[PDB]
Amino acid sequence: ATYKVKFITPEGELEVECDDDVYVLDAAEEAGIDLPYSCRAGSCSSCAGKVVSGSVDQSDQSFLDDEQIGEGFVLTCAAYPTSDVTIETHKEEAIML
Numbered sequence: 654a655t656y657k658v659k660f661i662t663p664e665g666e667l668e669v670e671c672d673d674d675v676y677v678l679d680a681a682e683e684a685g686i687d688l689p690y691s692c693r694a695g696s697c698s699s700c701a702g703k704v705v706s707g708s709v710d711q712s713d714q715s716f717l718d719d720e721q722i723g724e725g726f727v728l729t730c731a732a733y734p735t736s737d738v739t740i741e742t743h744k745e746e747a748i749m750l
């Protein structure tokens with residue numbers, strides 16, 4: 654399966670295709686979109702986003718509190734789409750402060 658990932662970025666809204674076993678960040682980078690990252694391993698705040706519609710599988714992530722996952726935050730370097738999904742990007746600040 655291949656899913657449509659819609660990114661809501663501070664610059665605007667863009668959609669890419671992302672295979673079901675490709676991390677969202679990597680589909681963005683493969684499309685020419687520069688989204689932030691640092692560890693690329695699921696253990697930092699840098700690539701954080703917020704799921705506003707649909708679902709992901711981000712069981713390879715460790716950094717987020719279940720409160721944080723329950724509120725919709727996702728680590729894009731560690732999240733597979735499981736449906737068409739819309740993600741607000743550049744939410745590092747919100748999962749620190």
Ligand code: FES
Binds near residue numbers: 728
């Ligand atoms: S870049 Fe560190 S968790 Fe994604």
Ligand SMILES: [Cl-]
Binds near residue numbers: 735736737
């Ligand atoms: Cl879907």
